[PDB]
Every structure is written in C-alpha cells, then in structure tokens.
C-alpha cells in the first residue's frame, strides 16, 4: 500500500520511505515518518496495518535500549535483526499475530554495513537492496538494472532519484514526498527530504 526502499553500498546504507498517512479515500497526514531509531547505527522501517506498526516497532525499541543500559555497549545489527525475527515467529501461532512487513538497516564497526529483509511471516534475508509495498513491483527492475556493488553514495542518490521518478509515472497512488536517511561510520544522517512539486 505504501513504499520504502533499501539501497546498500560498500560503506553505507541508503534508506528512504514515503511520508503519507492514508485513510479511506483521503490522506490524513502528508509528513508522516516510518523511521524508527533504536541505536546510533540501527534504523527500523515498518509497514503494515494500523495498530501493529506502531506498537510492535516500539516494543523492539525498548528492548534494544534496555540491552545497552544493562551492558554498556550496543547490539550488532545482525543480532538486533535476529531478535526481531524471534518476536514475530513466537507471536505468529497465537490469538493476536502481528501483520507487519519490515526491513532493518544497520552499520557495524566489525562487518560494516548490513541490510535485512522481513515480511509478516518472519523470514530473514541478507539482501543488497530490497523494497516493500506495491511500488516494489515497479521499482525493483530499475534497481537491479543499474546496481553496482562498488557504487558511490553520490550516484546512489541519483539512482534513488531515477527509481522514484518512475514511481510517479505509472503508479496510481499519489506519493508526493520521500524522506531519506543515510547510515555510515558516523551514525544516522538526514539527507534532503526529496519531493516533486505538485503545484
């Protein structure tokens, strides 16, 4: 229903999502945020139904923050992503399963950048690039058309630019704006909130 993207580089991870909070036929909010920090080098990008995206993803956030206070150092991105997979899979065969699709992005000082992929059935996948939503059918074919393992972060943004211009050409939903992050050795950095002026 709504979209996010996962370009991963040699020493960085470039993530982006939309900003639209939808309703029946109207859009309630145009500057929503799908992006959840847990640590200084780990993000979280959650997509799903109404109540489960907010409450599951902040339930993870209170456990990652608790691990750092009890020990002094943070989780790896691998262990953080592999802790979330346990929490869906235990809560899957239950009276109240969570229906969320997510992908986690992180940087580590040992193994460098990392990107993981999940769904509402809790399957992990270490992937070089990924996407959710119905726009993933449109936009994955541009991305493996032009992907290089040794891609610089300056041209990775314009690869993301090309990958989002086509999403406003042959896709029936509106999606005007997109918020962009970048993760590296120095942590989270905000990039420009790229958009297309509908005036």
């Amino acid at each position: 229903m709504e979209y996010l993207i996962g370009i991963q580089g040699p020493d960085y991870v470039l993530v982006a999502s939309d900003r639209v909070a939808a309703s029946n036929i109207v859009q309630m909010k145009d500057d929503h945020d799908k992006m959840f920090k847990m640590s200084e080098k780990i993000l979280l990008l959650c997509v799903g139904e109404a109540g489960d995206t907010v409450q599951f993803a902040e339930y993870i956030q209170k456990n990652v923050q608790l691990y750092k206070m009890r020990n002094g150092y943070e989780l790896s991105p691998t262990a953080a992503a592999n802790f979330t997979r346990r929490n869906l899979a235990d809560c899957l065969r239950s009276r109240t399963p969570y229906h969320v699709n997510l992908l986690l992005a992180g940087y580590d000082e040992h193994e460098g950048p990392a990107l993981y992929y999940m769904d509402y059935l809790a399957a992990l996948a270490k992937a070089p690039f990924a996407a959710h939503g119905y726009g993933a059918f449109l936009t994955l074919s541009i991305l493996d058309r032009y992907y290089t393992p040794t891609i610089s972060r300056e041209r990775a943004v314009e690869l993301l630019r090309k990958c989002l211009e086509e999403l406003q050409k042959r896709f029936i939903l509106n999606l005007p704006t997109f918020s962009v992050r970048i993760i590296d050795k120095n942590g989270i950095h905000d990039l420009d909130n790229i958009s297309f002026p509908k005036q």
Binding site: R70, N71, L75, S76, T78, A79, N82, F83, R86
Partner: peptide
C-alpha cells in the same frame, strides 16, 4: 543463542 543467534559474552 536461541534469541540472538550469537555466542554469549562471558561477563553477562
């Protein structure tokens, strides 16, 4: 190891 898929640090 079941929860995190990583060997445990010796202190904790």
């Amino acid at each position: 190891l079941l929860q995190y898929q990583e060997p445990i640090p010796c202190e904790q």
